[PDB]
Amino acid sequence: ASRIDEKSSKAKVNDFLAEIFKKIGSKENTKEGLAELYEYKKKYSDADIEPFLKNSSQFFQSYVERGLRVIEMEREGKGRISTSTGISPQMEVTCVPTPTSTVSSIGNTNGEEVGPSVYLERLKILRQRCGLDNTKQDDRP
């Protein structure tokens, strides 16, 4: 424990945030990292994050702030996502549109049919690079 204790307060939070940034830094985990940052920012309406941004390099700070607004736009559903209510392509005119393999979609998953798993899986994978979560007994492992 420390008398200032203020350092300890930001110490824990920074590490958590740091994990989110590493996801942002990777191209693959950018959606995941941005999405959590947006949600976290929503929880704390920012406020808490600013000290962290100054702490890191200045150039990198502008992009993250810009990226967060666009994530919300998708959540809002405004119009980027939308194209039509639900119209299937037709050559000329039909009584009823006919579904096709391209037009139709199939929901297939392989152990990743739950949202939390992506977070658990991606973060661990980035994380093992940082360290090892493998603990073993010193005596006859």
Side-chain angles (χ1 to χ4, degrees), residues 8-84:
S8 59
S9 165
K10 66 181 290 189
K12 292 180 180 180
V13 86
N14 283 161
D15 182 353
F16 179 68
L17 291 171
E19 292 176 1
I20 292 170
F21 285 106
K22 185 178 181 180
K23 288 183 290 189
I24 292 171
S26 284
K27 69 182 187 294
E28 292 177 0
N29 304 107
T30 221
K31 185 177 181 293
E32 296 296 340
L34 291 171
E36 293 179 3
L37 179 57
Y38 176 76
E39 291 176 2
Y40 177 92
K41 186 178 180 80
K42 200 175 178 65
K43 293 179 184 299
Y44 298 86
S45 309
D46 184 353
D48 182 354
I49 293 168
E50 173 59 276
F52 190 91
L53 292 224
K54 292 179 183 293
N55 283 330
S56 181
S57 298
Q58 297 297 306
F59 181 80
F60 177 77
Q61 301 302 313
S62 299
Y63 176 74
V64 58
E65 183 69 7
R66 183 180 293 178
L68 292 172
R69 183 177 63 88
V70 291
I71 294 299
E72 182 177 11
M73 125 185 296
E74 293 176 3
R75 295 291 183 214
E76 293 295 337
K78 287 175 183 291
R80 290 289 177 211
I81 292 167
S82 282
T83 317
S84 52

Side-chain angles (χ1 to χ4, degrees), residues 81-96:
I81 292 167
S82 282
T83 317
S84 52
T85 297
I87 304 300
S88 276
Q90 65 185 44
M91 291 177 69
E92 292 177 1
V93 50
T94 64
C95 294
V96 51

